Design an enzyme around this catalytic site. Structure first.
Site, mmCIF file in Angstrom:
data_model
loop_
_atom_site.group_PDB
_atom_site.id
_atom_site.type_symbol
_atom_site.label_atom_id
_atom_site.label_comp_id
_atom_site.label_asym_id
_atom_site.label_seq_id
_atom_site.Cartn_x
_atom_site.Cartn_y
_atom_site.Cartn_z
ATOM 1 C CD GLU A 82 -6.779 16.875 -52.507
ATOM 2 O OE1 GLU A 82 -5.957 16.434 -51.673
ATOM 3 O OE2 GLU A 82 -6.768 18.058 -52.911
ATOM 4 C CE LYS A 266 -3.985 18.943 -48.392
ATOM 5 N NZ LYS A 266 -4.637 18.420 -49.631
ATOM 6 C CG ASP A 282 3.260 5.795 -38.487
ATOM 7 O OD1 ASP A 282 2.479 6.715 -38.809
ATOM 8 O OD2 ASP A 282 3.615 5.598 -37.310
ATOM 9 C CG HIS A 380 -8.969 20.049 -57.816
ATOM 10 N ND1 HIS A 380 -8.526 18.840 -57.325
ATOM 11 C CD2 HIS A 380 -9.909 20.488 -56.947
ATOM 12 C CE1 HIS A 380 -9.171 18.560 -56.205
ATOM 13 N NE2 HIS A 380 -10.015 19.545 -55.954
HETATM 14 C C1 ZKE Z 1 -3.521 16.973 -64.796
HETATM 15 C C2 ZKE Z 1 -4.486 18.151 -64.668
HETATM 16 C C3 ZKE Z 1 -5.360 17.955 -63.432
HETATM 17 C C4 ZKE Z 1 -5.383 18.188 -65.902
HETATM 18 O O1 ZKE Z 1 -4.598 17.955 -67.034
HETATM 19 P P1 ZKE Z 1 -4.732 18.991 -68.308
HETATM 20 O O2 ZKE Z 1 -6.122 19.113 -68.742
HETATM 21 O O3 ZKE Z 1 -4.433 20.366 -67.914
HETATM 22 O O4 ZKE Z 1 -3.757 18.489 -69.538
HETATM 23 P P2 ZKE Z 1 -3.956 17.054 -70.325
HETATM 24 O O5 ZKE Z 1 -3.466 17.132 -71.699
HETATM 25 O O6 ZKE Z 1 -5.372 16.766 -70.545
HETATM 26 O O7 ZKE Z 1 -3.222 15.833 -69.495
HETATM 27 C C5 ZKE Z 1 -1.832 15.704 -69.588
HETATM 28 C C6 ZKE Z 1 -1.356 14.620 -68.684
HETATM 29 O O8 ZKE Z 1 -1.929 14.778 -67.318
HETATM 30 C C7 ZKE Z 1 -2.348 13.406 -66.897
HETATM 31 N N1 ZKE Z 1 -3.754 13.369 -66.733
HETATM 32 C C8 ZKE Z 1 -4.476 14.381 -67.102
HETATM 33 N N2 ZKE Z 1 -5.783 14.151 -66.864
HETATM 34 C C9 ZKE Z 1 -5.682 12.778 -66.272
HETATM 35 C C10 ZKE Z 1 -6.578 11.895 -65.790
HETATM 36 N N3 ZKE Z 1 -7.987 12.244 -65.795
HETATM 37 N N4 ZKE Z 1 -6.205 10.732 -65.317
HETATM 38 C C11 ZKE Z 1 -4.910 10.358 -65.288
HETATM 39 N N5 ZKE Z 1 -3.908 11.155 -65.745
HETATM 40 C C12 ZKE Z 1 -4.329 12.326 -66.216
HETATM 41 C C13 ZKE Z 1 -1.951 12.470 -67.982
HETATM 42 O O9 ZKE Z 1 -0.674 11.865 -67.667
HETATM 43 C C14 ZKE Z 1 -1.817 13.296 -69.175
HETATM 44 O O10 ZKE Z 1 -0.850 12.717 -70.080
HETATM 45 P P3 ZKE Z 1 -1.410 12.120 -71.512
HETATM 46 O O11 ZKE Z 1 -1.323 13.064 -72.624
HETATM 47 O O12 ZKE Z 1 -2.816 11.728 -71.487
HETATM 48 O O13 ZKE Z 1 -0.707 10.928 -71.978
HETATM 49 C C15 ZKE Z 1 -3.698 19.462 -64.579
HETATM 50 O O14 ZKE Z 1 -4.578 20.539 -64.738
HETATM 51 C C16 ZKE Z 1 -3.006 19.575 -63.220
HETATM 52 O O15 ZKE Z 1 -1.955 19.058 -63.034
HETATM 53 N N6 ZKE Z 1 -3.638 20.329 -62.154
HETATM 54 C C17 ZKE Z 1 -3.008 20.434 -60.854
HETATM 55 C C18 ZKE Z 1 -3.951 19.745 -59.873
HETATM 56 C C19 ZKE Z 1 -3.261 19.437 -58.550
HETATM 57 O O16 ZKE Z 1 -2.144 19.781 -58.353
HETATM 58 N N7 ZKE Z 1 -4.005 18.713 -57.537
HETATM 59 C C20 ZKE Z 1 -3.415 18.389 -56.255
HETATM 60 C C21 ZKE Z 1 -4.538 18.300 -55.225
HETATM 61 S S1 ZKE Z 1 -5.135 19.972 -54.849
HETATM 62 C C22 ZKE Z 1 -4.429 20.504 -53.264
HETATM 63 O O17 ZKE Z 1 -4.662 19.512 -52.303
HETATM 64 C C23 ZKE Z 1 -2.927 20.719 -53.417
HETATM 65 C C24 ZKE Z 1 -2.590 22.209 -53.376
HETATM 66 C C25 ZKE Z 1 -2.836 22.815 -54.756
HETATM 67 O O18 ZKE Z 1 -3.397 22.856 -52.431
HETATM 68 C C26 ZKE Z 1 -1.121 22.352 -52.976
HETATM 69 C C27 ZKE Z 1 -0.614 23.787 -53.118
HETATM 70 O O19 ZKE Z 1 -1.336 24.765 -52.791
HETATM 71 O O20 ZKE Z 1 0.547 23.987 -53.561
HETATM 72 N N1 NAD Z 2 -4.385 22.073 -49.720
HETATM 73 C C1 NAD Z 2 -5.780 21.660 -49.475
HETATM 74 O O1 NAD Z 2 -6.161 21.476 -48.381
HETATM 75 C C2 NAD Z 2 -6.742 21.482 -50.690
HETATM 76 C C3 NAD Z 2 -6.509 22.222 -51.813
HETATM 77 C C4 NAD Z 2 -7.328 22.095 -52.889
HETATM 78 C C5 NAD Z 2 -8.404 21.204 -52.841
HETATM 79 N N2 NAD Z 2 -8.637 20.461 -51.728
HETATM 80 C C6 NAD Z 2 -9.694 19.628 -51.743
HETATM 81 O O2 NAD Z 2 -10.951 20.446 -51.700
HETATM 82 C C7 NAD Z 2 -11.838 19.694 -51.115
HETATM 83 C C8 NAD Z 2 -12.544 20.479 -50.035
HETATM 84 O O3 NAD Z 2 -13.274 21.514 -50.644
HETATM 85 P P1 NAD Z 2 -14.766 21.839 -50.024
HETATM 86 O O4 NAD Z 2 -14.742 21.644 -48.538
HETATM 87 O O5 NAD Z 2 -15.165 23.255 -50.370
HETATM 88 O O6 NAD Z 2 -15.832 20.738 -50.613
HETATM 89 P P2 NAD Z 2 -16.624 20.811 -52.065
HETATM 90 O O7 NAD Z 2 -15.868 21.678 -53.038
HETATM 91 O O8 NAD Z 2 -16.751 19.425 -52.604
HETATM 92 O O9 NAD Z 2 -18.093 21.472 -51.822
HETATM 93 C C9 NAD Z 2 -18.132 22.851 -51.525
HETATM 94 C C10 NAD Z 2 -19.581 23.408 -51.813
HETATM 95 O O10 NAD Z 2 -20.604 22.609 -50.970
HETATM 96 C C11 NAD Z 2 -21.802 23.582 -50.890
HETATM 97 N N3 NAD Z 2 -22.502 23.385 -49.572
HETATM 98 C C12 NAD Z 2 -23.758 22.933 -49.605
HETATM 99 N N4 NAD Z 2 -24.178 22.834 -48.333
HETATM 100 C C13 NAD Z 2 -23.174 23.228 -47.527
HETATM 101 C C14 NAD Z 2 -23.075 23.322 -46.149
HETATM 102 N N5 NAD Z 2 -24.065 23.011 -45.099
HETATM 103 N N6 NAD Z 2 -21.951 23.750 -45.593
HETATM 104 C C15 NAD Z 2 -20.895 24.094 -46.374
HETATM 105 N N7 NAD Z 2 -20.985 24.004 -47.727
HETATM 106 C C16 NAD Z 2 -22.130 23.572 -48.293
HETATM 107 C C17 NAD Z 2 -21.311 24.754 -50.943
HETATM 108 O O11 NAD Z 2 -22.052 25.555 -51.921
HETATM 109 C C18 NAD Z 2 -19.709 24.593 -51.395
HETATM 110 O O12 NAD Z 2 -19.393 25.536 -52.462
HETATM 111 C C19 NAD Z 2 -11.034 18.415 -50.442
HETATM 112 O O13 NAD Z 2 -11.296 17.221 -51.286
HETATM 113 C C20 NAD Z 2 -9.830 18.735 -50.435
HETATM 114 O O14 NAD Z 2 -8.930 17.514 -50.494
HETATM 115 C C21 NAD Z 2 -7.820 20.583 -50.644
HETATM 116 C C1 MEV Z 3 4.336 6.482 -28.300
HETATM 117 C C2 MEV Z 3 4.422 7.270 -29.607
HETATM 118 O O1 MEV Z 3 5.729 7.203 -30.112
HETATM 119 C C3 MEV Z 3 3.439 6.678 -30.618
HETATM 120 C C4 MEV Z 3 4.128 5.626 -31.484
HETATM 121 O O2 MEV Z 3 3.554 5.645 -32.763
HETATM 122 C C5 MEV Z 3 4.040 8.733 -29.365
HETATM 123 C C6 MEV Z 3 4.949 9.379 -28.319
HETATM 124 O O3 MEV Z 3 6.170 9.070 -28.253
HETATM 125 O O4 MEV Z 3 4.473 10.236 -27.525
#
Ligand code: ZKE
Ligand code: NAD
Ligand code: MEV
Lengths: 421, 375
Positions: A82, A266, A282, A380
C-alpha cells in the site's frame, strides 16, 4: 553513530537508495546483492517452508527514515503493498526527532500456555488443587527446557481460570506463564503444556483437551511515547493548535465508535505488519493479539492514546502486545529476514518489539494528522496515481505519464484519469 | 476442472508448475511468471510504495481439493508458516465427500464515515441531514461516473450520533456505497471528502474525519462445511469422539478470549495468504475480522461448529471480507493478476466467498489436530 534522516532518499533510485544504505551501515557486497537481485529466497528453502510450493511472490522492500528510539537512530525495513505508508511514517518520525524522537520500553517476554481440562464435576475445587501444587508444576515445566532456563527464561508462574457453565459443561483452563526470551514462544510453551498435562490430570481427575499457546499476549507488552508541538503541525491553512484539537477530536471518535476504532487500529498495523513481514515473523499472531487487546475492556477501542499536555503539546502513547522473535522459523531461514535484523541492529526480541510500537504510533499519527487537516486523499492519492492510471485503461506506456496529469490537476480519480480518451 | 491434484505434495515445484499450467491452460507467459524469480520489476515496485530499496519474497503455494458451490477451484496462498497449505488441502478433501464448501455473500457495500463536531443540536441535525440524503447521494456519485456505469455507487445514507464524548457530541454520517469489484477504500474516501461541505451546510457543525470504516459489516461473506464422523475416526478415538472434542474446543473459544484470539488467528492463517497472493490489503481484512469478532462486546469465535440432527459436524464462517479484483495493487502486481486467473473469479464477492471457505477449512484442520492429540 548512525544518522537516519536520509535527505532526498524519496527521490533516489532503488539502486541509489540501496547504495546509500550500504555505506551508512557497512553492509558487505553479498548483503547488497541480496536486495539488488531477485530470488534472494532460494527455491529449496521456499519449498521446505510451506507445502505445495510452486514459486515465490514478491512485495516491495523499503526503509522508513528519521526514526530515533531512546536517543539512538534506527533504519526500519518495511514490506507492504500500500502506498503512502512508508512516506507518512518517515514524515511523523521526522517531526518526533525535534523533541527527542520516540521513548520506548517493554515488559519481559511472557507468554500464556493454555491447558484445557474437561470431564470434571468440581472445576472450582480442582483449580485450588492445581494452585496448591503450583511449584511442583512449574518445576516439571522448567525441567523440560534447561536451555531456555540457562538463557534467562522459563516458566515463572501458573494461573487457573474456570468456566463452570459452558454449553459443553464445566471447563478449567490453566495458564503457564513462560518467559520465552528471544523467541515468539509458540513451540516453547506448547511443549511445556504437553509436559504438565498428565500431572494436571492426576491432580484434578479430569481429561485434558487443548494444550496450546494463547495469542492474546497481554503480558508481552511494548510501549512507545511521542511528543509533537503545535508549531510543527502548522499549515498554510490551519494553525497547529487547531490541528492538535482536530487530532483530539479524531481520537475521541475512535474511543467511542468501533466503526472508527477498527480503521484507527488498522492504520497502526499498516506500520507494524510490514516490519513483521520484513523480519520473517508471524503477522497473523501480531494482528490477533493487537485487536483482541483493543477490546479487553468489553468495548473495542483505540490501541493508542492522544492527549494535550499542560504545555499545549500533543502527546501520544501506544501500549499493546507484541510477540516477536529473533530466532525460530522464517526469521533464520529467509536471508532477507536476517538482513533486516542486521539493518535494525536489534539484539533482543524485546528491542525489536519496541521499534514496532514506535512505528505503529508514528503511523497512527500520520493518518490522523492528514485526516484532521487536508484529508487523507491529497497526500495518499498522489502516491497512488500510477495504479489509478492502470485502472482507467491505460497501463501500457500511457501510465507513468497520465499519473502526472492527475496529480497536477489535484484530481486523482478514475473519472479523470480516463481523460486519455 | 478437477482440483484434487494427486501426488502433488512430494512432487517438485517445477512439476507442480507443470501441472497447474496443464490443468488451466496457462500461457507460457503465465508459467514464466513463476518459473523465473523476479515477476515484480523494480520499475513497478518503485511506484507501489515509497523508499523502495529491494523486493521481499515469500513462497507461492496452491491449496488442493477445494470445491465451492460445486465448482472446483485452485487457491494460491502466500505465507511463511508451515502446515497451513497442508491442513487446508486435507480439510477441503474431506469436504468434497459431502458436497464441498457452500458459500454466499452480500452486496459489495462499504461504509464511509463523515464525522461532524460542534453541532449544538445533533439529534435534530441528524433528521435534517437524512431528509436531504438524495442530494448527498447524487453529489457523491457524480464524483465516480465510472463506478455508477458499472452498476455501483453510493446507495444510501445512515446517520449515527454520539451525545457523550469528552470532545462534545458528534454526528457521524455513513455513506453506503456499492463498490462492485474494488475493495473500495479510496473510492468511498473520495465520496466522503466530496459530500462534507454540503453536510456542514445542512448541519451547521465542523466536519473532521472523512474516511471509510474497516468494520465492513455490510460486506459479509459466508461459508459452510459438513463433515461426517466416519471421516474423522483416528487410531485411538472414534469419529464421534473426535466430533465431541471439536465441539469442546469451539465452546472453549466461545467463552475465553484467550482461546478465541488463537482460534481466530488460525482462521486468518488461511485467509491472509490468499489476500496477499491476490495483491489485496491484508491489514483491512484483519481489522474487519477481529473487530467483528467482538461486536457484542465479548471477543468470541468467528466460526461456529455444531452437531446436526444426523450427528454430522457442521461449520460456518460469516465475517466482513472487503477484497478487490481491481484497484489498490491488484491490477498492478503481475502475480496478483495471475492469482485471479488461477482462481477464475469474475467478481470481488466471489473472491470473498473463496476466502471465507479457506478460513473455515483452516480452522477445522487446527481443531481436528488439537482435539485428536493424545496425552
Ligand atoms: C507524507 C504524505 C503522504 C505527503 O507528504 P506532504 O506532501 O504532505 O509533505 P512533504 O513536504 O512533501 O514531505 C514531508 C516528509 O514526508 C516524507 N515523504 C513525503 N513524501 C515522501 C515520499 N514520496 N517518499 C518518502 N518519504 C516521503 C518525507 O520524510 C518528507 O520529509 P523531507 O522534507 O523530504 O525530508 C502526507 O500527506 C501524509 O503523511 N499522508 C498520510 C497518508 C497515510 O497516513 N497513509 C497510510 C495508508 S492509508 C490507510 O490504510 C490508513 C488509514 C488512513 O485508513 C488509517 C486511519 O483511518 O486512521
Ligand atoms: N484503512 C483502509 O483499509 C484503507 C484506507 C485508505 C486507503 N486504502 C487503500 O485504498 C486502496 C483501495 O481503494 P479502492 O478499492 O477504491 O481501489 P482504487 O482506488 O485503486 O480504484 C478505485 C476506482 O476503480 C474504478 N473501477 C473501475 N472498474 C471498477 C469495477 N469493476 N469495480 C469497482 N471499481 C471499478 C472505479 O472508478 C474506482 O473509483 C487499497 O490500496 C487500500 O490499501 C485502504
Ligand atoms: C494451531 C494454531 O495455533 C495455528 C498456529 O499458527 C491455531 C489454533 O490454535 O487454533
Amino acid at each position: 553513530s548512525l544518522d537516519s534522516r536520509l535527505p532526498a532518499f524519496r527521490n533516489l533510485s532503488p539502486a541509489a537508495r540501496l547504495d546509500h544504505i550500504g555505506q551508512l551501515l557497512g553492509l558487505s557486497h553479498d548483503d547488497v546483492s541480496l536486495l539488488a537481485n531477485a530470488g534472494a529466497l532460494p527455491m529449496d528453502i521456499a519449498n521446505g517452508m510451506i507445502e505445495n510450493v510452486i514459486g515465490t511472490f514478491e512485495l516491495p522492500y523499503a526503509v522508513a527514515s528519521n526514526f530515533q528510539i531512546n536517543g539512538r537512530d534506527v533504519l526500519v525495513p518495511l514490506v507492504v503493498e500500500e502506498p503512502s505508508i512508508v512516506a507518512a511514517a518517515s514524515y511523523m518520525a521526522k517531526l518526533a526527532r525535534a523533541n527527542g524522537g520516540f521513548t520506548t520500553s517493554s515488559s519481559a517476554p511472557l507468554m500464556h500456555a493454555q491447558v484445557q481440562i474437561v470431564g470434571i464435576q468440581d472445576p472450582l475445587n480442582a483449580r485450588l488443587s492445581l494452585l496448591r501444587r503450583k511449584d511442583e508444576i512449574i518445576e516439571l515445566a522448567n525441567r523440560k527446557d534447561q536451555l531456555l532456563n540457562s538463557l534467562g527464561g522459563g516458566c515463572r508462574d501458573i494461573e487457573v481460570h474456570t468456566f463452570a457453565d459452558t454449553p459443553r459443561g464445566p471447563m478449567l483452563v490453566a495458564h503457564l506463564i513462560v518467559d520465552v526470551r528471544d523467541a515468539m514462544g509458540a513451540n516453547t510453551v506448547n511443549t511445556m503444556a504437553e509436559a504438565v498435562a498428565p500431572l494436571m490430570e492426576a491432580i484434578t481427575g479430569g481429561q485434558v483437551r487443548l494444550r496450546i499457546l494463547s495469542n492474546l499476549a497481554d503480558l508481552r507488552l511494548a510501549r512507545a511515547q511521542v511528543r509533537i508541538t503545535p508549531q510543527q503541525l502548522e499549515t498554510a491553512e490551519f494553525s497547529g493548535e487547531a490541528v492538535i484539537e482536530g487530532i483530539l477530536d479524531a481520537y475521541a471518535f475512535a474511543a467511542v465508535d468501533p466503526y472508527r476504532a477498527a480503521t484507527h487500529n488498522k492504520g497502526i498495523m499498516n506500520g507494524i505488519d510490514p516490519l513483521i513481514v520484513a523480519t520473517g515473523n508471524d503477522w497473523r499472531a501480531v494482528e490477533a493479539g493487537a485487536h483482541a487487546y483493543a477490546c479487553r475492556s468489553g468495548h473495542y477501542g483505540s490501541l493508542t492514546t492522544w492527549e494535550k499536555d499542560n504545555n499545549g503539546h500533543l502527546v501520544g502513547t501506544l501500549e499493546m502486545p507484541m510477540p516477536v522473535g529473533l530466532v525460530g522459523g522464517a526469521t533464520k531461514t529467509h536471508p532477507l529476514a536476517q538482513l533486516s535484523l542486521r539493518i535494525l541492529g536489534v539484539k533482543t526480541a524485546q528491542a525489536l518489539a519496541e521499534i514496532a510500537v514506535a512505528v505503529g504510533l508514528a503511523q497512527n499519527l500520520g493518518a490522523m494528522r492528514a485526516l484532521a487537516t487536508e484529508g487523507i486523499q491529497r497526500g495518499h492519492m498522489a502516491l497512488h496515481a500510477r495504479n489509478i492510471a492502470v485502472v482507467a485503461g491505460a497501463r501500457g506506456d500511457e501510465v507513468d505519464w497520465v499519473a502526472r496529469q492527475l496529480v497536477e490537476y489535484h484530481d486523482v480519480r478514475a473519472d479523470r484519469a480516463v481523460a486519455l480518451l
